[PDB]
Amino acid sequence: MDKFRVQGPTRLQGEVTISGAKNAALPILFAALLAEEPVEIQNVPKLKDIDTTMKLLTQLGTKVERXGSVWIDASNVNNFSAPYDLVKTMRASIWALGPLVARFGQGQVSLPGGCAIGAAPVDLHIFGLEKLGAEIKLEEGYVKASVNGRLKGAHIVMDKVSVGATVTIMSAATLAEGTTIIENAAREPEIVDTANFLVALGAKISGQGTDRITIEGVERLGGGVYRVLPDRIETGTFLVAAAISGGKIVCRNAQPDTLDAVLAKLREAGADIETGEDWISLDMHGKRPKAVTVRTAPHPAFPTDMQAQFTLLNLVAEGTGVITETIFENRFMHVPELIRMGAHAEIESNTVICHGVEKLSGAQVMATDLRASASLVLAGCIAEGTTVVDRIYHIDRGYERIEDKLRALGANIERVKGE
Numbered sequence: 001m002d003k004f005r006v007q008g009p010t011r012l013q014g015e016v017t018i019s020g021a022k023n024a025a026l027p028i029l030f031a032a033l034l035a036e037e038p039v040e041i042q043n044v045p046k047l048k049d050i051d052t053t054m055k056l057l058t059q060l061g062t063k064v065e066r067x068g069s070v071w072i073d074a075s076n077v078n079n080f081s082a083p084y085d086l087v088k089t090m091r092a093s094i095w096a097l098g099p100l101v102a103r104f105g106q107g108q109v110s111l112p113g114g115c116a117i118g119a120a121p122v123d124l125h126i127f128g129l130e131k132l133g134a135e136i137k138l139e140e141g142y143v144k145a146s147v148n149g150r151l152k153g154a155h156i157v158m159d160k161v162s163v164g165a166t167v168t169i170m171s172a173a174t175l176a177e178g179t180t181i182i183e184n185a186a187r188e189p190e191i192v193d194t195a196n197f198l199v200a201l202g203a204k205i206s207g208q209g210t211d212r213i214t215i216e217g218v219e220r221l222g223g224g225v226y227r228v229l230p231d232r233i234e235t236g237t238f239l240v241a242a243a244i245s246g247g248k249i250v251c252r253n254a255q256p257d258t259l260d261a262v263l264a265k266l267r268e269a270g271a272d273i274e275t276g277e278d279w280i281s282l283d284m285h286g287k288r289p290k291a292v293t294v295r296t297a298p299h300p301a302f303p304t305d306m307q308a309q310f311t312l313l314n315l316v317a318e319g320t321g322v323i324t325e326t327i328f329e330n331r332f333m334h335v336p337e338l339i340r341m342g343a344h345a346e347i348e349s350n351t352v353i354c355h356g357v358e359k360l361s362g363a364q365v366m367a368t369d370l371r372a373s374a375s376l377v378l379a380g381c382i383a384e385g386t387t388v389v390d391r392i393y394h395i396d397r398g399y400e401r402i403e404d405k406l407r408a409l410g411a412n413i414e415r416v417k418g419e
């Protein structure tokens, strides 16, 4: 089991080029199942999740290749089942379901359990699919979908905001008969990205980015070329990296507009931030961050995907900070890890009360999920001494070359083996 050996403290400064959004490349890769014609998805990050996705696609009968871009040929998709062995490591696997039934009249996906930040119920996916006319069956640890003829447009009122379900529903609706309305749709930039991708294929979608998405189904989707938007969470992660280390950083290939809340939060922490068309600069001026209050919520609010990072920020900030996680139920795994590093925090249900300390101490800590893993590595960067982050495979799933990137920023980091 690989681990990150990190030597701190090290001020994180310099530049980083933001990779394509894992969160947009994923739903787009899946949406590509809808494409009858060649598809080119550009700016796709090199992540384990992308590999897993590519493998899954291939299993379905998709022709897939990659470098920067991922080339997809789903003309011959002829296998409508995503087996446990292929979906097991990735919650996003559910995305194969919608495209499959929407295009093929049938699909089945083994239910992945998802990472420990919280359960992965897919009731909203099923809900929307059912609304679209699909018959859903939960059997054999599988979610089975079918429909006679085409899916049918429907007015789908989402009682909960779901990034994943919004993608499934939006995607599936592009092939439905008639118009679909997704009320209370997730607004995430990844939804906009996926919607734009769909449109590039011939889909009729509007309202993406707003709480109301309108899809006018079409008989079939063609092909196209689409560039995945920058990874806002990667961007936020690097920003925080500088923000907690008294550093200065410039994020290249960034999309400032996808980070309003995070940037404002960083400003609250005292960061000197500037933004350009495709870049974001953060300058701490050697300053310690100021503690902040964070309430995660659906886009455009503060992203739960920045939660662990901000917890860290608070933990080394000046003052008492409060972080409320409203999206996931088990997303405080990083807290004990950080406390082992000398952090001071109390958890009250979905809120973590942070008491920033001047300095962390290197420790043996364990990555439990994507964001937390990255958080721990950052903590190792600024902590005094040696930090060993175990199970970095977590980070490999969703970060492209974080090791290289961190190194380029001055981090003393090493990937080691040994369970």
Ligand SMILES: CC(=O)N[C@H]1[C@@H](OP(=O)(O)OP(=O)(O)OC[C@H]2O[C@@H](n3ccc(=O)[nH]c3=O)[C@H](O)[C@@H]2O)O[C@H](CO)[C@@H](O)[C@@H]1O
Binding pocket: 022, 023, 024, 026, 091, 092, 118, 119, 120, 121, 122, 123, 124, 125, 126, 160, 161, 162, 163, 164, 165, 186, 190, 303, 304, 305, 327, 328, 329
């Ligand atoms: C691959 C990808 O893009 N992952 C992101 C996506 O995941 P994900 O799509 O899983 O996020 P959701 O928005 O759907 O989940 C939000 C909340 O809704 C619940 N829920 C979701 C679906 C459903 O059918 N029923 C249900 O109860 C969840 O378990 C959680 O408690 O959005 C999250 C919220 O910004 C991010 O943190 C994840 O990194």
